[PDB]
């Protein structure tokens, strides 16, 4: 039997946030934990939930898995409807990409001895930005099989070669001592609507009128700001008439652009005043004494 | 196609020496079946038997299945033709070949399984391996 | 047993298969047995079986047999891997609600199961909502699950 | 009070939903209760993690209920080892509304946190409001003479995220969230939501007054006291002083919009000039 | 087809061939789309006579590629 | 060929509506 590149690691919405929260809190320590879930078939590894391991002490590296902590948490999670086996482990790489070092390879061999399809997921909480999390799932290449002249896994599809390996990972042993498993995310309608509540302002704020003394003062200041910008904007028009096309951008570097700031001031004021007017007009009928 | 089989085996060989991976290996086998589809000519597979043996797991499934593409329209004898290529029973890694033979057989009788349906229906019924059920 | 799927009765934990509302004279131990002894209930014909497996196991079909006197089941609700109080069975979502017909409940009838929903079954509970002849109590036979281990 | 605002992080909401979906499986569909973990910053709570606790109650009797408090201590120590700065700040339950027995449960939780904050986290996706309702237990001293009783006082709740928490949330909401809408469109959508929220709350008060009118619920005399204050605060927009000031203010903002629109047209014509110069220059050389 | 009918095996073969993205063995379905380009002469006996059709164009405009 | 030109133009017009609908839709998602 040979592993397939079509294999996918499915991380739930809950499991993704816990690794990011634990990984960011533990910066720069390679804070590790266990990934609970279920090996659905030979091509799916589901990560329903994860739980973080304590740090035994100081040191930016992956510590050994504490069997008592693992046994006690697994035993207690079964009491709250979490009877899912450990399908691997996760650890954080705070800013230097997602790969496995020498210590991580030994840590993964411990899991592969118990479960042959265990997955080592690496999360980069520092390099992860909004809408794009730097995550990767790795499983070791047996040196005996690859040295003899066999590919670590068979290729029966395109699914395993859609993501181009990074140079940082290829430097640190990717496709030599471990291989990457494509990661998909299990998101349901309920969990998506729940997260949409983030930064959702209260209904009071929509009808709340900004302080009129400060609104006039802000209108006062910004209109005065455009007074100088308009004076500078006239100079920019004459200057750019007699400017070589190589200086259309170089000469704009380090010097403030009157046109650009004029648009920002116009955009801010027109959003500010229209909302203040519209909200005020709405409140005159909604909150009416008659 | 048999009589007018003006295939160019120099093109296939020039890419056989450029095969270094399993993906490039299975590509040539699918390529081989394409240039010889309906020509009933497995000359490339006959003269490169030790090279074809490098295929493992589903590449064996694809390689055995390539026979049906080559022998498409060979209604005259296909059960004996496939059994000639494939022994009845084999222990090591024969599920991919046995399953591939069944799906090669359907490739021979594509849209024309007048009487091979009963054979494929029996083998799928008396099938234990998941791979053989896949080819069947 | 159907070809390719074994009788899973030896696989289950006999010590660990509990029953709810079971008359003492005929109990769960006599239920799993192939012989004539049954599993009758005391409080009502309504009865709740709980079956915990030793290893992960798939259930392809079941033989939940009962005597044709009318005490055999006519409504079986199957629940998989619950984290069951005779009120949940009244209002819940069974994995595959099954109306065990007279052919299904005799000594030879087997009941097909939705093999899709029965794949990872570490513990299964079968509930008898109603019997065939509207009697006070029910009776069972060698209730065995036919399938294969997850492995 | 002791709590000014409760900030509930998206991890808790996902954890609470997962708690409900794994206990409220084929077993049942009751409310599930867990334990809230977070820190304290000035007077705003920072609920940031939670773990489930075994819990059950009787559908009929409210005084019969069980909470595995030993399980509470064992997992708290489990969580304290990973993150010591995250202490118990209260409990949660997914019940769509409060229950009669929460005041008893809070007393059990009050041992582990004296200022325990109960946050009701509705798993159902309510359309207009936040899923979180944060309550704290207070001793209501009635003036009618009725003896002082323990009650829940509402605390304003907000959903905020950590930097890495918000990174993952934006990843999960990458496709669903539409960020193309400008600020001005968003603010008007806030006003529509504000109108919808007010109408719903006005409907709730009207529904309560309907029950009181028909005798379904008793006359409270604290809600009615508050209701007179609400109707008294209703401003008179027909006053001459107010209308003139409103016109005085509206015209003050209009001239600023007019000036900004006037500048916008000039800048837009400057862009059109550059485009036509670029287009003419490109075709001259080609 | 030559008449204009939607050739069912050709349509089916191409789509399942495009599923080689998910399953490489599915690439053999393109054999269904391979329609031979021929003119078959027959008699009243449904046999093939020695008939030599004439192509009124240059031999090189439609011919097999020159082997390497 | 007079009917064919009229019908060919009708399909070409209808295709233009399809193309102009998808371009506006793509512009909305390209901004996203
Ligand atoms: Zn590492």
The answer to whether D and F touch (≥3 CB pairs < 8 Å) is yes
- Ligand 1 center from residue A107 Cα (angstroms): 9
Give yes or no for a contact between D112 and D29, defined as CB atoms under 8 angstroms apart: no
Which of B21, B23, B56 is opposite residue A2, by nearest beta carbon? B56
Give yes or no for a contact between C31 and C65, defined as CB atoms under 8 angstroms apart: no
Asked whether residue D254 falls in the same domain as residue D115, the answer is no
Asked whether residue D143 falls in the same domain as residue D237, the answer is no
Which phi and psi (to 5°) does residue D267 adopt? -65, -35
For residue B48, give Cα distances in angstroms to B41, B69, C92, D15, E16.
13, 18, 63, 58, 28
Site from E18, E23, E27, E38 to mutate, B interface, most B CB atoms within 10 angstroms: E27
Q: Which of D152, D183, D214 marks a domain boundary?
A: D183
Element (DSSP H or E) covering residue F26: helix F2-31
Which of A38, A80, A81 is opposite residue C120, by nearest beta carbon? A38
Asked whether residue D39 falls in the same domain as residue D172, the answer is yes
Rounded distance between C-alpha atoms, residue B69 and residue B110, angstroms: 10
Asked whether residue D102 falls in the same domain as residue D229, the answer is no
Q: Which two tokens stand for residue E51?
A: 């008939």
Give yes or no for a contact between C60 and C68, defined as CB atoms under 8 angstroms apart: no
A104 is in an annotated binding site: yes
Please indicate if any CB of chain A lies within 8 Å of the CB of E25: yes
Please indicate if any CB of chain A lies within 8 Å of the CB of E59: no
Asked whether residue D232 falls in the same domain as residue D159, the answer is no
Asked whether residue D105 falls in the same domain as residue D27, the answer is yes
Asked whether residue D155 falls in the same domain as residue D84, the answer is yes
- Chain A residues within 8 angstroms (CB to CB) of chain B: 1-2, 151, 154-156
Q: Which of D130, D150, D183 marks a domain boundary?
A: D183
Element (DSSP H or E) covering residue A41: strand A32-41
**Chain A residue with the nearest C-alpha to that of D130:** A197
- A9 Rama sector, left if φ>0, alpha if ψ -120 to 50, beta otherwise: beta
D264 lies in which domain range?
224-283
Site from B23, B24, B61 to mutate, A interface, most A CB atoms within 10 angstroms: B23
Interchain pair F31, D178: CB under 8 A: no
Rounded distance between C-alpha atoms, residue A75 and residue D74, angstroms: 11
Residues in chain E closer than 8 A to A159 (CB atoms): 21-22
Domain presence at residue D198: no
The residue whose two tokens read 């750019």 is A240
* Alpha-carbon distance B6 to nearest alpha carbon in chain A (angstroms): 31
Domain presence at residue D120: yes
Residues in chain A closer than 8 A to B22 (CB atoms): 151, 154-155
Asked whether residue D140 falls in the same domain as residue D253, the answer is no
Residues in chain B closer than 8 A to E66 (CB atoms): none
Site from C83, C122, C123 to mutate, A interface, most A CB atoms within 10 angstroms: C83
Which of C83, C120, C122 is opposite residue A81, by nearest beta carbon? C83
Q: Which two tokens stand for residue D273?
A: 């000039």
Q: Quote the number of domains for chain D.
A: 2
Interchain pair A38, C122: CB under 8 A: no
Q: Which two tokens stand for residue E20?
A: 């080689």
Domain presence at residue D199: no
Q: Which two tokens stand for residue D212?
A: 């009181």
Domain presence at residue D264: yes
Asked whether residue D178 falls in the same domain as residue D234, the answer is no
A172 is in an annotated binding site: no
- Chain E residues within 8 angstroms (CB to CB) of chain B: 8-9, 24-25, 27-28, 30-32, 34, 36, 38, 64-65, 67-68
Domain presence at residue D131: yes
Chain A segment 142-181 residues within 8 A of D by beta carbon are none
Asked whether residue D75 falls in the same domain as residue D171, the answer is yes
Strand boundaries in chain D, DSSP class E: 5-8, 33-41, 44-52, 55-57, 65-67, 87-93, 117-121, 132-140, 149-155, 157-159
Q: What is the DSSP string of chain C?
A: --TT-EE-GGGB-STT--EES--TTS-HHHHHSSSS-----SS-S-EEEEEEEEEEEEEEEEE----TTTTSEEEEEEEES----SSTTTSS--SS-B---HHHHSSS--EE--TTT-SSEEEEEEEEEEESS--SS------EEEEEE--
The residue whose two tokens read 């699914």 is A159
* Alpha-carbon distance A77 to nearest alpha carbon in chain C (angstroms): 11
Task: Give ∠ CA D140-D145-D146 in degrees, rounded to 5.
Answer: 60
Rounded distance between C-alpha atoms, residue C100 and residue C120, angstroms: 23
* Alpha-carbon distance A79 to nearest alpha carbon in chain C (angstroms): 8
Rounded distance between C-alpha atoms, residue C40 and residue C141, angstroms: 10
- Ligand 1 center from residue A100 Cα (angstroms): 5
The residue whose two tokens read 């059960």 is B79
Chain B segment 59-118 residues within 8 A of E by beta carbon are 61-62, 65-66, 68-69, 72, 100, 103, 107, 110-111
Domain presence at residue D168: yes
Residues in chain C closer than 8 A to D59 (CB atoms): 87
Interchain pair C84, D25: CB under 8 A: no
- Ligand 1 center from residue A91 Cα (angstroms): 7
Residues in chain A closer than 8 A to B23 (CB atoms): 155
Radius of gyration of chain E (CA): 17
Asked whether residue D66 falls in the same domain as residue D132, the answer is yes
**Chain E residue with the nearest C-alpha to that of A162:** E21
3-state secondary structure of A134: strand
Interchain pair A83, C120: CB under 8 A: no
Question: Which of D120, D119, D81 shows the shortest CA–CA distance to D97?
Answer: D120
C87 Cα distance to chain centroid: 18
Q: How many CB atoms lie within 10 A of CB A239?
A: 11
Residues in chain D closer than 8 A to A248 (CB atoms): none
* Residues contacting D252, CB < 8 A, separation 6+: A216, A219
Domain presence at residue D137: yes
A22 is in an annotated binding site: no
Which phi and psi (to 5°) does residue D265 adopt? -65, -40
Asked whether residue D109 falls in the same domain as residue D15, the answer is yes
Residues in chain A closer than 8 A to C122 (CB atoms): 83
Give yes or no for a contact between A43 and A7, defined as CB atoms under 8 angstroms apart: yes
Q: Which two tokens stand for residue B109?
A: 């009788």
* Alpha-carbon distance A176 to nearest alpha carbon in chain C (angstroms): 30
Residue length, chain E? 68
Please indicate if any CB of chain A lies within 8 Å of the CB of E62: no
* Alpha-carbon distance A172 to nearest alpha carbon in chain B (angstroms): 23
**Chain A residue with the nearest C-alpha to that of B96:** A1
Q: Which of D131, D166, D183 marks a domain boundary?
A: D183
Domain presence at residue D200: no
Question: Which of A285, A154, A143 shows the shortest CA–CA distance to E23?
Answer: A154
Interchain pair B6, E64: CB under 8 A: yes
């Amino acid at each position: 039997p040979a592993v397939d590149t079509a294999e996918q690691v499915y991380i739930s919405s809950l499991a993704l946030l816990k690794m990011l929260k634990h990984g960011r809190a533990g910066v720069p320590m390679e804070v590790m934990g266990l990934m609970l879930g279920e090996f659905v078939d030979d091509y799916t590894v589901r990560v329903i939930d994860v739980f973080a391991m304590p740090q035994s002490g100081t040191g930016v590296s992956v510590e050994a898995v504490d069997p008592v902590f693992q046994a006690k948490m697994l035993d207690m999670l079964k009491q709250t409807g979490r009877p899912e086996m450990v399908v691997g482990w996760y650890h954080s790489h705070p800013g230097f990409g997602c790969w496995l070092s020498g210590v991580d390879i030994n840590t993964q061999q411990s899991f592969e001895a118990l479960s042959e399809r265990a997955v080592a997921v690496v999360v980069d909480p520092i390099q992860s930005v909004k809408g794009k999390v730097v995550i990767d799932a790795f499983r070791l290449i047996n040196a005996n099989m690859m040295v003899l002249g066999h590919e670590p896994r068979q290729t029966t599809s395109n699914l395993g070669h859609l993501n181009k390996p990074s140079i940082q990972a290829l430097i640190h042993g990717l496709n030599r001592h471990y291989y990457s498993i494509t990661i998909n995310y299990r998101k349901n309608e309920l969990e998506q609507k729940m997260l949409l509540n983030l930064h959702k302002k209260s209904w009071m704020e929509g009808l709340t009128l900004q302080d009129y003394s400060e609104h006039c003062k802000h209108n006062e200041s910004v209109v005065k700001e455009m007074l100088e910008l308009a004076k500078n904007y006239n100079k920019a028009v004459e200057e750019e008439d007699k400017m070589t096309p190589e200086q259309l951008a170089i000469k704009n570097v380090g010097k403030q652009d009157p046109k650009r700031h004029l648009e920002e001031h116009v955009d801010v004021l027109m959003t500010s005043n229209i909302v203040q007017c519209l909200a005020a007009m709405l409140d005159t009928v909604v909150f009416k004494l008659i | 196609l048999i009589r007018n089989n003006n295939t160019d085996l120099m093109i296939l060989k020039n890419t056989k020496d450029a095969v270094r991976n399993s993906v490039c290996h299975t590509a040539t086998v699918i390529a081989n079946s394409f240039m010889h589809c309906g020509t009933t000519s497995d000359q490339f597979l006959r003269d490169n038997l030790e090279w074809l043996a490098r295929a493992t797991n589903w590449a064996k499934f694809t390689a055995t299945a390539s026979l049906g593409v080559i022998h498409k329209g060979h209604e005259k004898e296909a059960l004996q033709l496939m059994a000639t290529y494939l022994p009845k029973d084999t222990s090591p890694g024969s599920a991919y070949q046995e399953g591939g033979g069944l799906y090669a057989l359907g490739l021979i009788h594509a849209n024309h399984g007048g009487d091979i349906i009963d054979y494929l229906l029996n083998q799928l019924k008396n099938a234990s391996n998941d791979i053989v059920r896949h080819g069947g | 047993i159907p070809k390719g799927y074994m009788d899973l009765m030896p696989f289950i934990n006999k010590a660990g298969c509990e029953c709810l509302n079971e008359s003492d004279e005929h109990g769960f131990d006599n239920c799993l047995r192939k012989d004539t002894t049954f599993l009758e209930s005391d409080c009502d014909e309504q009865l709740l079986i709980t079956v915990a497996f030793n290893q992960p196991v798939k259930l392809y079909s079941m033989k939940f047999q009962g005597p044709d006197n009318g005490q055999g089941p006519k409504y079986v609700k199957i629940f998989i891997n619950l984290p069951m109080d005779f009120e949940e069975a009244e209002r819940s979502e069974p994995t595959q609600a099954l109306e065990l017909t007279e052919d299904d409940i005799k000594e030879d009838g087997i009941v097909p199961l939705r093999y899709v929903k029965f794949q990872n079954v570490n513990s299964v509970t079968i509930f008898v909502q109603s019997n065939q002849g509207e009697e006070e109590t029910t009776r069972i036979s060698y209730f065995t699950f036919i399938g294969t281990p997850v492995q | 009070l002791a709590v000014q605002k409760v900030v509930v992080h998206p991890l808790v909401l996902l954890s609470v939903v997962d708690h409900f979906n794994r206990i409220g499986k084929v077993g049942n569909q009751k409310r599930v209760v867990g334990v809230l973990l977070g820190s304290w910053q000035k007077k705003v709570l920072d609920v940031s993690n939670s773990f489930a606790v075994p819990f059950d109650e009787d559908d009929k009797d409210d005084s019969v209920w069980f909470l595995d408090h030993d399980y509470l201590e064992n997992m708290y120590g489990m969580f304290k080892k990973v993150n010591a700065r995250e202490r118990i700040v209260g409990w949660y339950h997914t019940g769509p509304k409060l229950h009669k027995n929460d005041i008893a449960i809070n007393e059990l939780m009050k041992r582990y946190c004296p200022n325990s904050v109960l946050v009701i986290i509705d798993v159902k996706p309510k359309d207009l409001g936040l899923p979180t309702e944060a309550y704290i237990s207070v001793e209501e001293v009635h003036d009618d003479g009725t003896p002082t009783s323990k009650t829940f006082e509402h605390v304003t709740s907000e959903i905020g995220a950590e930097e890495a928490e918000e990174v993952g949330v934006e990843h999960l909401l990458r496709d669903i969230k539409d960020t193309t809408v400008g600020t001005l469109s968003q603010r008007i959508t806030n006003q529509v939501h504000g109108l919808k929220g007010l109408n719903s709350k006005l409907l709730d008060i009207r529904s309560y007054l309907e029950k009181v009118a028909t005798g379904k619920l008793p006359i409270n005399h604290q809600i009615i006291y508050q209701l007179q204050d609400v109707f008294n605060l209703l401003p008179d927009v027909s006053l001459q002083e107010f209308v003139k000031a409103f016109y005085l203010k509206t015209n003050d903002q209009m001239v600023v919009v007019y000036l900004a629109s006037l500048i916008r047209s000039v800048v837009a014509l400057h862009n059109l000039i550059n485009n036509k110069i670029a287009n003419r220059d490109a075709e001259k050389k080609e | 087809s030559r008449t204009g009918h939607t050739h069912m095996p050709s349509v089916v073969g191409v789509l399942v061939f495009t599923q080689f993205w998910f399953w490489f063995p599915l690439s053999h379905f393109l054999s269904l789309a391979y329609t031979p380009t021929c003119v078959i002469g027959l008699n009243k006996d449904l046999k093939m006579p020695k008939v030599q059709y004439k192509s009124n164009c240059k031999p090189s405009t439609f011919a097999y590629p020159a082997p390497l | 060929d007079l009917y064919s030109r009229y019908k060919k133009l009708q399909q070409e017009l209808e295709f233009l509506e399809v193309q102009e609908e998808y371009i506006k839709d793509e512009q909305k998602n390209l901004k996203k």
